Design a protein around this ligand. Structure first.
Ligand SMILES: *[C@@H]1O[C@H](CO)[C@@H](O[C@@H]2O[C@H](CO)[C@@H](O)[C@H](O)[C@H]2NC(C)=O)[C@H](O)[C@H]1NC(C)=O
Lengths: 355, 34, 220, 231, 337, 51
C-alpha cells in the first residue's frame, strides 16, 4: 500500500530536485512534471506517480497558451487513460451493499420463525428436521456475521475477530447447505440408511470442518500478514478460505443433477403434464442446493469497472442474500407436516377460544 | 470466487486507496489549470 | 426425600435405562401385515398371531398373520401383503371385493399394499384347458385385449397373458379408483415356487420409504 | 431365600479380614444389601450398605474409611473388606436384604452370622432391658426416637426384629404399621410421632427373645438397646 | 323354520312395543333443568414416559396410586403416579396387547390381546420379581377386555362374540356367555360384581348374570361397532362408545337407550369411555387425538383433554376420583386433574 | 338354530321393566349422591391433591 503521506513526500522530493535542475521555451514546474527545454514537446508521464500510466506521455507546444484563457496548454489524457471513476465505483459498491442488506434481513427474519417452529413442535423432531435446524441456524449466523463485519470494518484485535467470524460463519452456511444435499442424496440413494449415526458426523462436519481451515487462516495472518484488520487480501492467502467453499458449491451442484436426473426417470417410467411436474421439482429443490452458486464460482478477480464484475456482484448479492428466504418457505412453511402442526395447534387454540 | 469475500477484498482496497486517489485528482486538476 | 424414596427413584432410573435399551434394540425392525383368505397360499409365501421374522440385505422384517376390527393394530406398519388366488374365478369377485375393502380401509389410507396373485400356474393351466372362461364371470373379458407394447413374457401363451393382464388390470384400477397418490398398489405373481418374493417385498418397502421421503420433500 | 455368611476366625489386632454373604433364592440384583453386627453381649449395630446396581454406598462413622462394601451380582455375593481391625470389632456379623419401592418390606430377610474375635445420629432407646411375661398374656413394648420418624410422604420408618436364643433376627413389623410375610397375625404395631409401640396378644411359646427397634429415615441405621422377654 | 322366524319377528315386535310404551319421557327432557357443569379444565399433572410404542390399555390399582399400562412395545409397566416412579417393568410374551387389568387385592395384574390368552402376573411375591402365575386359554377370538372379580375369578370378552368367566386357580371356564353376533369389544363388571355388560361390533349391548350365565337383557341403539363399555358407578346403567362417532347411555331397569352423545364436528369414533366417581362426567377418548368430558346427564362437552399427539386409546379413573389417566397412540401416558 | 333364538327372545321379553323416567332418575340421584366426592368435578385443594 502507498499512502497520501509517502505520495506527498515523493512529490516534494521531485519538486526540490526540479528546482535544483532549474538552478543549473524554458523549463518550469506545473505541480506534477518538469517540462524540459514551434515544436510539440513530448515528455514521459511522471514515473513517481503510482496511479499514472507510465507507458504514455504528455504533450506540449512551444510555451503554447490555451486559446480564450491565460493558462498554459498541456495534454495529459495518455497518463490518465487507465484510471477509473472513483465516484462511480463507490456508487456500485453502495448499491451492492443495499442488495444483500435487504435480502439477508428478510432471510434472517423468516429463518428465525422457521427454527422456532421446528423446535417448539416435538412432533416435528426427526433427523431431517434436526439437520434443517442446523442449516437454518447457519443461514442466520452467516447473515449476522455479515452485519457485524459490516459494522466494524466500515464504520486491532477487535476487528480481526469480526473478520474471523465472518469467514467462519460464512463457511459454515456453505457447508450446511452441502449437508442438506448430502442428506437428501443418501435419503434417496442409500437403502434404509442409518439416520441417528449420521447426525453426529453431519454436525461435526458442518460446524467443525469450517473452523479447521479458518483457524489455519488466523495462524497464517498472525504469523505472516499481521496488518490491519485482515480485511485486505494478502496475496494467495485468500484461497485458504475460498477454495474449500468453492469445493462445496461444485459438490452440491453434482448432487443436484443426480436428484433431478432420477426425478426425471421416475416421471417417465410411471406430454406437457409431465414436464410441469419435473419443472416444479427442480425449482423448489434449487434453493436448498444453492444451484445459483455454480454460475460465477470460477470467476477470477476482475476489474471493478468491468462488465463481468458488475454482472457477478449484482447477480450473486441478490441470490446469495435471498437463499435463506426461499429455504425457509419451501422446506419449513410448505412442508405438509409443518402445516398440519400449525393447523392442529391453531385448532387447539381455537378450542380454547370455544370456552 | 466467493463473491462475498471478493466484495470485502474489493471494498477494502477501494477505501484504502481512497487517500491517494483524492490527492491525485486535485493535483491533476491543478495541472490542467496551469 | 427419604432414603427409601431415594432407593425407589434409583430403581426407577434403572428401569428407565432398561426400557431405553430395549427400545433401541427393537427400533430397527420393519413390520408387515399379511392378509388374504383360504385356498390362496397366504401363509405359504415365505419359508392367535403367527408372527414370523426374516432378514434380507441386513434388514429385518416382522410379518404378522392374524386369525375386520383389529386392523387398527397394524396402522403404523410398513406394508400389507394382501395375497389373492387368481386360479378360481367364482371367488375372484369376492377377492376383488376384499381388496376394495382393504384398499379403502380408513385405517390403511397411507399403507401401500403389496398385492399378490397366486397360483398363476393353475390359472395358465385352466386357460389352456379351456374348461372355464373368465368371460363367464367377467363379461368385459370378452372385450379385452392385451397391450401390444407392455407384455414382457418368457414365451408364454398369449391367452394366458391376456387373462392375467385382465385380472391384474381389474385389481390395479380398483386400487387407483381413488388413492390420491398417498399409497400405491404393487402387483406381483406367485406360483408357490417363486422364491423371489422376499426380494419383491424388500424392493417395494424401499420404494414406499422413498415415496414417503419424496412426499416429505415435496418432490412428488 | 438363603443368605449364608462366611468369614470369622481368630485375628490379631491391626490385621484385616474379608466377610462374604452368598445369596440364593431371590433376585439379588434387585435387592440392596446391608451389614449388621452384634457385640458378644450387646445389641445390634449397622455397619454398611450397598444399593442395587452399586449406585449408592454408605458406611458407619464408627467404621468408615477402614471398611469397604462391594457386591458381585452375577456371582450373587456380597463382600465386606475389613481393614485396621480394632478390639471393638469383635462381634457376630449378619447380612440383610432390602428392596426399595412403593409398598415394599425392607430388611425382609436376615441370615446366620459369622463370629469375629480379635485378641449426629437419630437415637432410639428402650427403657426396659428385661420384662418377665407369662403365656397367654398381652405384652406391649414401646420404643421412642430422637426425632419424628414421620415423613412428608406419610411413612413412619420404624422396624421391629425378634432374636430368639441361638437364632438370627427376624422382621415382624415394617414402617411401624405393616405386618410381614410368614409372621402370625398376633403381632401388631402402632403409635404416633416419636411414640411407637408393638403389641402382642395371646402370647405363646416360640415367642421368647430380644426385641430390637430400628429406624430408616436417614443413615446411619441405629438399633435400640434390646428388650429381652423371659418366662 | 318359517314358523320359528315368524315367532321370532313377533317376539321382537312385542319387545319393541313394550319397551316403547315404558318411554313415558326422555332423560334429555328430564335433565333440562339442572346446573350445567361448565368447563372441565384438566391439566396434565403427570406425564409418564418409558413406553416407546402406542399405549393400548391402562388400569388403575385399587389404591388409586399404582396403575398398570400395556403398550404395543410389549411391556406392562406399573407406575407409582405419586412419584412418577416405575415400580415394576413386566415384559409381555406377546406385544399385541389390547387390554390390561389390576387385581383388586393388588397382588396380580391381567393382560390380554390378539393372542386370545389372558395372562395373570403375580406382583406381591417373594424373590422380589413379578412372575407369570396363570394363562387363561380357551377364547377363540382376540381378547378385548378383562377384569378381575377377586384373586381367583376373572371375566374376559373376546372377538369370537363371547364372554367367559375363569377360575384362575383351576384356570377353567366356569361360565360362557353367548348371544352376541359381532366381536365383543369391551366389558364392565358391575360394582357388586354380580352382573356385567358387554358391547360388540353388532351394535348391541347385553347384560349378563355372572352366576346364572344367561343373558338378562339386550340393547340395540347403535348403527356401528361399539368399541367401549363402562358401568355407571350406581350399577344400574352403562355407557357405550362406538364407531358411530357417538356415545350412548343405556339403563338396565328400563331396557332401552337413554342418551346419545354426539357432535357435528365429531365424526371420529369413540376409542374408550369411563366414568368419574360421581358418574356425572362420562369421559370419552376419541380418535381425533383428544378426550371429551361429556355431561352424562346433559350429553354436552363440558371439557376437553387435548394433550395427546395421537389417538387416545385408553381412559380410566381412580377409585377415589382424584385423577384421570389417559393413554394415547403417542406412547405417553398422562394423568390429568 | 332358530329354536334357540326364539327361546332367548322369549326369555328377554318375559322380564320386568320400569319406566325410563324412573330409570334415568336413578342415575341422576346416584350422581347427586356421589357428586360431593369427585375431585374430577370439583378440584380438590392443591395440598390434598397427590399430583
Ligand atoms: C463519475 O461518476 C459520477 C457518478 O457516479 C458522475 O457524476 C454524476 O453524474 C451523473 C450524470 O452522469 C449526475 O446525475 C450526478 O449528479 C453526478 N454526481 C455528482 C456527485 O455530481 C461523474 O460525472 C463521473 N465522472 C466521469 C469522469 O465519468
Amino acid at each position: 500500500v502507498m499512502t497520501k503521506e509517502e505520495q506527498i513526500f515523493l512529490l516534494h522530493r521531485a519538486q526540490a530536485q526540479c528546482e535544483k535542475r532549474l538552478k543549473e521555451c524554458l523549463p518550469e514546474w506545473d505541480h506534477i512534471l518538469c517540462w524540459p527545454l514551434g515544436e510539440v514537446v513530448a515528455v514521459p508521464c511522471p514515473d513517481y506517480i503510482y496511479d499514472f500510466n507510465h507507458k504514455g506521455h504528455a504533450y506540449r507546444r512551444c510555451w503554447e497558451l490555451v486559446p480564450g484563457h491565460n493558462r498554459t496548454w498541456a495534454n495529459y489524457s495518455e497518463c490518465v487513460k487507465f484510471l477509473t471513476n472513483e465516484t462511480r465505483e463507490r456508487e456500485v459498491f453502495d448499491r451492492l451493499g443495499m442488495i444483500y442488506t435487504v435480502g439477508y434481513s428478510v432471510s434472517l427474519a423468516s429463518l428465525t420463525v422457521a427454527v422456532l417452529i421446528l423446535a417448539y413442535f416435538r412432533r416435528l423432531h426427526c433427523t431431517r428436521n434436526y439437520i434443517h435446524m442446523h442449516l437454518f441456524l447457519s443461514f442466520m449466523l452467516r447473515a449476522v456475521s455479515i452485519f457485524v463485519k459490516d459494522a466494524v470494518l466500515y464504520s486491532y484485535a477487535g476487528c480481526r475477530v469480526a473478520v474471523t467470524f465472518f469467514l467462519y460463519f460464512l463457511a459454515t452456511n456453505y457447508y450446511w447447505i452441502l449437508v442438506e444435499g448430502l442428506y437428501l442424496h443418501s435419503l434417496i440413494f442409500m437403502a434404509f440408511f442409518s439416520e441417528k449415526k449420521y447426525l453426529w458426523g453431519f454436525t461435526v462436519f458442518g460446524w467443525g470442518l469450517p473452523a479447521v481451515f479458518v483457524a489455519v487462516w488466523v495462524s497464517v495472518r498472525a504469523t505472516l500478514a499481521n496488518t490491519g484488520c485482515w480485511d485486505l487480501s494478502s496475496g494467495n492467502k485468500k484461497w485458504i478460505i475460498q477454495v474449500p467453499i468453492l469445493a462445496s458449491i461444485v459438490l452440491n451442484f453434482i448432487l443436484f443433477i443426480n436428484i433431478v436426473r432420477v426425478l426425471a426417470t421416475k416421471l417417465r417410467e410411471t406430454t406437457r403434464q409431465q414436464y410441469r411436474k419435473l419443472l416444479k421439482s427442480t425449482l423448489v429443490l434449487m434453493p436448498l442446493f444453492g444451484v445459483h452458486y455454480i454460475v460465477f464460482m470460477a470467476t477470477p478477480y476482475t476489474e471493478v469497472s468491468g462488465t463481468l464484475w458488475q454482472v457477478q456482484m449484482h447477480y450473486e448479492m441478490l441470490f446469495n442474500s435471498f437463499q435463506g428466504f426461499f429455504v425457509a418457505i419451501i422446506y419449513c412453511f410448505c412442508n405438509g407436516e409443518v402445516q398440519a402442526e400449525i393447523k392442529k395447534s391453531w385448532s387447539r387454540w381455537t378450542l380454547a377460544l370455544d370456552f | 470466487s466467493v463473491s462475498e469475500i471478493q466484495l470485502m477484498h474489493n471494498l477494502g482496497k477501494h477505501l484504502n486507496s481512497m487517500e491517494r486517489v483524492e490527492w491525485l485528482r486535485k493535483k491533476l486538476q491543478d495541472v490542467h489549470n496551469f | 426425600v427419604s432414603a427409601e424414596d431415594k432407593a425407589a427413584a434409583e430403581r426407577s432410573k434403572m428401569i428407565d435405562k432398561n426400557l431405553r435399551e430395549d427400545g433401541e434394540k427393537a427400533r430397527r425392525t420393519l413390520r408387515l401385515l399379511l392378509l388374504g383368505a383360504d385356498n390362496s397360499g397366504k401363509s405359504t409365501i415365505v419359508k392367535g398371531i403367527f408372527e414370523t421374522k426374516f432378514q434380507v440385505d441386513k434388514v429385518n422384517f416382522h410379518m404378522f398373520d392374524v386369525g375386520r376390527k383389529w386392523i387398527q393394530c397394524f396402522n403404523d406398519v410398513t406394508a400389507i401383503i394382501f395375497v389373492v388366488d387368481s386360479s378360481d374365478y367364482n371367488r375372484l369377485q369376492e377377492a376383488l371385493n376384499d381388496f376394495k375393502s382393504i384398499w379403502n380401509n380408513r385405517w390403511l389410507r397411507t399403507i401401500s399394499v403389496i398385492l399378490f396373485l397366486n397360483k398363476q400356474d393353475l390359472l395358465a393351466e385352466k386357460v389352456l384347458a379351456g374348461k372355464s372362461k373368465i368371460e363367464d364371470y367377467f363379461p368385459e373379458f370378452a372385450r379385452y385385449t392385451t397391450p401390444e407394447d407392455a407384455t414382457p413374457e418368457p414365451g408364454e401363451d398369449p391367452r394366458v397373458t391376456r387373462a392375467k393382464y385382465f385380472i391384474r388390470k381389474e385389481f390395479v384400477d380398483i386400487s387407483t379408483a381413488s388413492g390420491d397418490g398417498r399409497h400405491i398398489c404393487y402387483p406381483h405373481f406367485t406360483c408357490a415356487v417363486d422364491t423371489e418374493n422376499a426380494r419383491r417385498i424388500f424392493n417395494d418397502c424401499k420404494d414406499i420409504i422413498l415415496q414417503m421421503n419424496l412426499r416429505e420433500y415435496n418432490l412428488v | 431365600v438363603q443368605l449364608v455368611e462366611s468369614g470369622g476366625g481368630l485375628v490379631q489386632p491391626g490385621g484385616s479380614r474379608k466377610l462374604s454373604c452368598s445369596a440364593s433364592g431371590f433376585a439379588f440384583s434387585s435387592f440392596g444389601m446391608h451389614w449388621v453386627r452384634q457385640a458378644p453381649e450387646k445389641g445390634l449395630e449397622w455397619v454398611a450398605y450397598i444399593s442395587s446396581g452399586s449406585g449408592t454406598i454408605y458406611y458407619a462413622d464408627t467404621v468408615k474409611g477402614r471398611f469397604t462394601i462391594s457386591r458381585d451380582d452375577p456371582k450373587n455375593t456380597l463382600f465386606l473388606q475389613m481393614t485396621s481391625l480394632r478390639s471393638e470389632d469383635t462381634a457376630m456379623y449378619y447380612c440383610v436384604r432390602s428392596i426399595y419401592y412403593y409398598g415394599s418390606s425392607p430388611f425382609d430377610f436376615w441370615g446366620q452370622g459369622t463370629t469375629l474375635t480379635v485378641s449426629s445420629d437419630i437415637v432410639m432407646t428402650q427403657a426396659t432391658s428385661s420384662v418377665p411375661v407369662t403365656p397367654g398374656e398381652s405384652v406391649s413394648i414401646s420404643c421412642r426416637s430422637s426425632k419424628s420418624l414421620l415423613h412428608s410422604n406419610g411413612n413412619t420408618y420404624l422396624y421391629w426384629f425378634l432374636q430368639r436364643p441361638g437364632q438370627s433376627p427376624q422382621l415382624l413389623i415394617y414402617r411401624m404399621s405393616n405386618l410381614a410375610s410368614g409372621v402370625p397375625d398376633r403381632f401388631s404395631g402402632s403409635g404416633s410421632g416419636t411414640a411407637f409401640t408393638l403389641t402382642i396378644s395371646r402370647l405363646e411359646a416360640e415367642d421368647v427373645g430380644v426385641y430390637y427397634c430400628m429406624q430408616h429415615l436417614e443413615y446411619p441405621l441405629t438399633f435400640g438397646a434390646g428388650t429381652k422377654l423371659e418366662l | 323354520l318359517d314358523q320359528l322366524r315368524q315367532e321370532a319377528e313377533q317376539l321382537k315386535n312385542q319387545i319393541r312395543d313394550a319397551r316403547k310404551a315404558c318411554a313415558d319421557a326422555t332423560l334429555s327432557q328430564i335433565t333440562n333443568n339442572i346446573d350445567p357443569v361448565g368447563r372441565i379444565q384438566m391439566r396434565t399433572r403427570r406425564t409418564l414416559r418409558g413406553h416407546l410404542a402406542k399405549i393400548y390399555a391402562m388400569h388403575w390399582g385399587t389404591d388409586s396410586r399404582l396403575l398398570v399400562s400395556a403398550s404395543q412395545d410389549g411391556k406392562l409397566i406399573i407406575w407409582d403416579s405419586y412419584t412418577t416412579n416405575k415400580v415394576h417393568a413386566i415384559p409381555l410374551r406377546s406385544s399385541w396387547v389390547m387390554t390390561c387389568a389390576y387385581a383388586p387385592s393388588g397382588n396380580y395384574v391381567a393382560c390380554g390381546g390378539l393372542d386370545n390368552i389372558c395372562s395373570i402376573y403375580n406382583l406381591k411375591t417373594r424373590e422380589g420379581n413379578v412372575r407369570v402365575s396363570r394363562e387363561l386359554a380357551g377364547h377363540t377370538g382376540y381378547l378385548s377386555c378383562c377384569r378381575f372379580l377377586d384373586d381367583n375369578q376373572i371375566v374376559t370378552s373376546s372377538g369370537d362374540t363371547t364372554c367367559a368367566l375363569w377360575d384362575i386357580e383351576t384356570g377353567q371356564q366356569t361360565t360362557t356367555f353367548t348371544g352376541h353376533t359381532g366381536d365383543v369389544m369391551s366389558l364392565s363388571l358391575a360394582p357388586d360384581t354380580r352382573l356385567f355388560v358387554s358391547g360388540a361390533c353388532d351394535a348391541s349391548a347385553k347384560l349378563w348374570d355372572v352366576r346364572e350365565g344367561m343373558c338378562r337383557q339386550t340393547f340395540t341403539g347403535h348403527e356401528s361397532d361399539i368399541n367401549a363399555i363402562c358401568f355407571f358407578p350406581n350399577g344400574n346403567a352403562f355407557a357405550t362408545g362406538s364407531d358411530d362417532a357417538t356415545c350412548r347411555l343405556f339403563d338396565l331397569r328400563a331396557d332401552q337407550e337413554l342418551m346419545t352423545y354426539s357432535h357435528d364436528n365429531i365424526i371420529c369414533g369413540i376409542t374408550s369411555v369411563s366414568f368419574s366417581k360421581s358418574g356425572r362426567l362420562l369421559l370419552a377418548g376419541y380418535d381425533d387425538f383428544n378426550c371429551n368430558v361429556w355431561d352424562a346427564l346433559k350429553a354436552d362437552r363440558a371439557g376437553v383433554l387435548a394433550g395427546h399427539d395421537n389417538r387416545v386409546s385408553c381412559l380410566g379413573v381412580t377409585d377415589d376420583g382424584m385423577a384421570v389417566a389417559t393413554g394415547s397412540w403417542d406412547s405417553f401416558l398422562k394423568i390429568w386433574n | 338354530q332358530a329354536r334357540k333364538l326364539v327361546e332367548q327372545l322369549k326369555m328377554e321379553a318375559n322380564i320386568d321393566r320400569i319406566k325410563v323416567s324412573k330409570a334415568a332418575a336413578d342415575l341422576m340421584a346416584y350422581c347427586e349422591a356421589h357428586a360431593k366426592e369427585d375431585p374430577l368435578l370439583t378440584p380438590v385443594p392443591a395440598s390434598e391433591n397427590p399430583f
